[PDB]
DNA sequence: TAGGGTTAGGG
């Protein structure tokens, strides 16, 4: 496939006790080409971890399954997120289900249609807030963007780039005041 | 409900 595999892959949480590769498989299939499809199981006790991943051909196709929740697997409703790499998964609060994004290193002339023309194509945007001084007014060099859709986030956020008001800025899920402060 | 013997050499 030519999209990178992280891009293709769907982690599935809280699966059912008796969900195996071949159910979970049976189920996602009805959305695409499957190129893996695994349940997650202790090594020693072969138990299910209550999760496992999905990867599709295309992206396209993981688009349709996540357009298609909610799921229900072997009799149990699960949770189908886009795939967190090993490597951001260390962040914090990186597996959480938001709907905030905070974005950093925005120009002090960046206005709300700057952030719509760049968030719009990945969702519908409930709130928009660009970030001042309460008392000097000053701009602050963030914003934060809520959408109506938490994979509107996943999908955001799994990226690396984005380009508001014609420069780079970093995009990351919002931590709450206790949340940012628990992470320092 | 966050990964499958899947992450820093040897010059």
Known sequence: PKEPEQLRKLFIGGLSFETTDE???SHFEQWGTLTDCVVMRDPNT???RGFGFVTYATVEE???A???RPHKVDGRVVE???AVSREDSQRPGAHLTVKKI???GIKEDTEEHHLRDYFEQYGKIEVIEIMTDRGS???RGFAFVTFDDHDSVDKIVIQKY???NGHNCEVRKALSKQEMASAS
Request: proline share 4%.
């Open 162 to 164: 984005h380009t508001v």
């Open 137 to 139: 007014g000053k701009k």
């Open 66 to 68: 996540m357009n298609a």
């Open 102 to 104: 905070f974005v950093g």
């Open 62 to 64: 993981v688009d349709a």
């Open 23 to 25: 159910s979970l498989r």
């Open 80 to 82: 189908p997120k886009r």
């Open 46 to 48: 072969k138990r299910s």
